[PDB]
Amino acid sequence: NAERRLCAILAADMAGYSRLMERNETDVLNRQKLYRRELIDPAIAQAGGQIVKTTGDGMLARFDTAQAALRCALEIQQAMQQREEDTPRKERIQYRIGINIGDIVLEDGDIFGDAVNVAARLEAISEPGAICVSDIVHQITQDRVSEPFTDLGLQKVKNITRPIRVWQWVPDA
Amino acid sequence: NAERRLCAILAADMAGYSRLMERNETDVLNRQKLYRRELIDPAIAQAGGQIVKTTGDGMLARFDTAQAALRCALEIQQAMQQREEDTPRKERIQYRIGINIGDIVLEDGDIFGDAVNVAARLEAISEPGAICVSDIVHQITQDRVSEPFTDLGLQKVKNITRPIRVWQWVPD
Incomplete structure (x- = not known):
């Protein structure tokens, strides 16, 4: 089963x-609703990912490589910068994105484990329009992506005893 | 005028x-909309605070004392847990609250300055239904407010240079 x-x-x-x-x-x-359909859902498919679910907490997707998760988020966040640039700042739509890695359990179209909780938390503390990745993700992806990340320090996550070192990328603005 | x-x-x-x-x-x-006018707006008014404004980023209020602000947050968060304990966990309503103290500018119904942005960041990163305060608020209230807080680490706030240490109280 699992x-x-x-x-x-x-x-x-x-x-x-x-x-x-x-x-x-x-x-x-x-x-x-439009962006989800025209920008997000496509980038995620193009990148090999699968949506696991969208809940009150937001959406959760998974990928086979760390690289593909990241290019997918960068693809999304960079297009969103363009798509909303002729809209005034305080009115723009912006997503937050977190990405993490771990041994997690899959079982009936749903995912489980600390590593999932950590991806979710990264999303929540990420700044709008940016992408936050755990340190594990960063050590694997740093050289695959030209886009720069900045150490953000440690982050305690509910019910995880060891805090996580979080790296962040914000768009050129 | 400022x-x-x-x-x-x-x-x-x-x-x-x-x-x-x-x-x-x-x-x-x-x-x-109901909680705002039956629970929240009155707690703030009873505690001597003043709603400054509401926006896409949420609501800002100001109080004259650190303890009044924290008392009000506590009163709100504790009620909201009770008013919602009957409804199922997924269909509940919850607020995040942040509190900071600092030298602000008050001008023309608006509030300006870094301590404000810091308070907005604490609200953002706080657990649903919990309260996050800055170290400053924690040191000023620790010994007048019995509710326990947990040291949550240093926290880089956007466009400010020194991380602020953040304290978090959760409802049981």
């Missing part, structure tokens, strides 16, 4: 647009 | 309900 493998996990969520604005932002919510 | 002063700054946003789900926003907007 297996263990080494996997590249990618978590993503949408930044911004607080529900406390007490307003239905149908225009903005329709744009993101 | 004004410079040392303030406690509370940032709060709503966790969860990722829009990558594409669910009907309508229902969740309403529930939060």
